Design a protein around this ligand. Structure first.
Ligand SMILES: C#CCN(Cc1ccc2[nH]c(N)nc(=O)c2c1)c1ccc(C(=O)N[C@@H](CCC(=O)N[C@@H](CCC(=O)N[C@@H](CCC(=O)N[C@H](CCC(=O)O)C(=O)O)C(=O)O)C(=O)O)C(=O)O)cc1
Ligand SMILES: C#CCN(Cc1ccc2[nH]c(N)nc(=O)c2c1)c1ccc(C(=O)N[C@@H](CCC(=O)N[C@@H](CCC(=O)N[C@@H](CCC(=O)N[C@H](CCC(=O)O)C(=O)O)C(=O)O)C(=O)O)C(=O)O)cc1
Ligand SMILES: *c1cc(=O)[nH]c(=O)n1[C@H]1C[C@H](O)[C@@H](COP(=O)(O)O)O1
Ligand SMILES: *c1cc(=O)[nH]c(=O)n1[C@H]1C[C@H](O)[C@@H](COP(=O)(O)O)O1
Lengths: 264, 264
């Protein structure tokens, strides 16, 4: 997509070399924002082939409150295997925080149902937020939240969403995170009877790993094809009730895949 | 500052009218980013004279872990008087979450000491964060955190910081929020023997209240002056021992005040 490949050239052009937690080395910039208007088409990158099956099942797993990869295995998705323990547990990462944030007085807050309630009854609230950054449980998480905090907004009967992502692997992770949140905005919008508006991505540390530079210059030499269209075939009775089969991605003709290694 | 007045103009040209919780009326946009290169000077606005006594005592009251308006009255700072209860308490707002985030098992995390030890021992970490958005205590706060989440970054011996502001009153709160976080980077960079880098500001619902249109038009025809420079007179023994008389602002020549009403 035009915004994605321009972000990639910017980290190459203004990036600082940094060492990091995995010992791989990155080129990174700090602070960036881009906007995708979802009425122009589904934001799935076309300059390399992305695996829709993984993007959709991880969202569904998140909306169930799950943090164990058994579900993802039943559906042949392996994106989270290198961080799970001997039992498949990842710790209280995204699903648990979204659906059951633990309070100090022994309650648990379902943040997704709260947001859905706000979008219906008080869409002009400036408090429609989901946070996965729970300071008191960070030490029990296998990997700290990269997509940390997001906010909804309603304006001319269109729902928008802005995400703050504190760490971003541009090549491997960011095509998955842009398509995931785009899908969530369409699902929230269908449940609230709102039109889809913009997805705003904001980044903290936006980096390219040193073992991903050939892949990056390869991809960057390719022209974006027309953006795909998403068809949802059913309106379920709640957001927690969607199935993989309700989603059709139409018109996706991407350039070939580019394999790259994940830094653990 | 140029960045500030262009955002003010963008809100008038592009904002949607919204009825807000105050009932005052707002013109809003959603999603904006501005960066200030702190090497170019202290970003205190000059198109209206800003009150620095309030900005610095409020930030020292926050790093003390205080939520009681008593300390601010002792220093004649009036900004938080109308959300405070009969005893002067605001609930566990900013200072309580920065210095003593309550965990579900009765412990407390001091996020400001964690950030100090992270910047001194692991400057490359992509996780140097403090969050005020404690979902388990939101209903106990007098007003929900507007400046909600921030992150620090170190690249070539320089300290940067990005704020996510989820709700922004452009005429009244935003001048104050920018200089507060600028000041904080200076104090953090001095205690960590780092140079200062950028302050990146990202906003969620960014707005201009209805009863501020005249004051905005009056501010929008003034020319920004050269930015001042911030002098810190002594190096305290910790980030917790700074005092009002420790800071100096040289070269600040603002346009007159501009008085305006706050929506409660
Ligand atoms: C963002 C996000 C979600 N995550 C989590 C996550 C955790 C830690 C991290 N750590 C890190 N340093 N960077 C990260 O970005 C990162 C991301 C995540 C995302 C992407 C990959 C990743 O490795 N992406 C690769 C490979 C995807 C893969 O697992 N997909 C399958 C594809 C199988 C296939 O092509 N199937 C076709 C074949 C058809 C037929 O049978 N022939 C099909 O299903 O139709 C795989 O490789 O097993 C990529 O995008 O290229 C890992 C984790
Ligand atoms: C950001 C921030 C800190 N706050 C808290 C806070 C709480 C609720 C809010 N509610 C709201 N709608 N908008 C806000 O910006 C807002 C901000 C905050 C900031 C500025 C004013 C404010 O009224 N600023 C005025 C007057 C400053 C004043 O106190 N200054 C002295 C002047 C002394 C001389 O003379 C005074 O009036 O006593 C301004 O900047 O014009 C109030 C609160
Ligand atoms: C986290 C998972 C996700 O959804 N998206 C991502 O981009 N990643 C990343 C970012 C970074 O490259 C790494 C996480 O490491 P760290 O905690 O930031 O040190 O995977
Ligand atoms: C919050 C306090 C601060 O530091 N900065 C701000 O701009 N504000 C604001 C924004 C908004 O006008 C109001 C908060 O109201 P709400 O919670 O967003 O509904 O004060």
């Amino acid at each position: 997509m035009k915004q994605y490949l321009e972000l990639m050239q910017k980290v190459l052009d203004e990036g600082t070399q940094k060492n990091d937690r995995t010992g791989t080395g990155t080129l990174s910039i700090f602070g960036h924002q881009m906007r995708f208007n979802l009425q122009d088409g589904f934001p799935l990158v076309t300059t390399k082939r992305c695996h829709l099956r993984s993007i959709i099942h991880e969202l569904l797993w998140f909306l169930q409150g799950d943090t164990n990869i058994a579900y993802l295995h039943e559906n042949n998705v392996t994106i989270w295997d290198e961080w799970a323990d001997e039992n498949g547990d990842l710790g209280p990462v995204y699903g648990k925080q979204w659906r059951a944030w633990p309070t100090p007085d022994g309650r648990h807050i379902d943040q997704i149902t709260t947001v859905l309630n706000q979008l219906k009854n008080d869409p002009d609230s400036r408090r429609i937020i989901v946070s996965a950054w729970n300071v008191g449980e960070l030490d029990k998480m296998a990997l700290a939240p990269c997509h940390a905090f997001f906010q909804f907004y309603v304006a001319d009967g269109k729902l928008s969403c802005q995400l703050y992502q504190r760490s971003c692997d541009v090549f491997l992770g960011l095509p998955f995170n842009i398509a995931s949140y785009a899908l969530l905005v369409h699902m929230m919008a269908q449940q609230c009877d709102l039109e889809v508006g913009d997805f705003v991505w904001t980044g903290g540390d936006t980096h390219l790993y040193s073992n991903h530079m050939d892949q990056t210059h390869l991809q960057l030499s390719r022209e974006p094809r027309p953006l795909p269209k998403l068809i949802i075939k059913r309106k379920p009775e709640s957001i927690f009730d969607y199935r993989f089969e309700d989603f059709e991605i139409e018109g996706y003709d991407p350039h070939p895949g580019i394999k790259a290694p994940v830094a653990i």
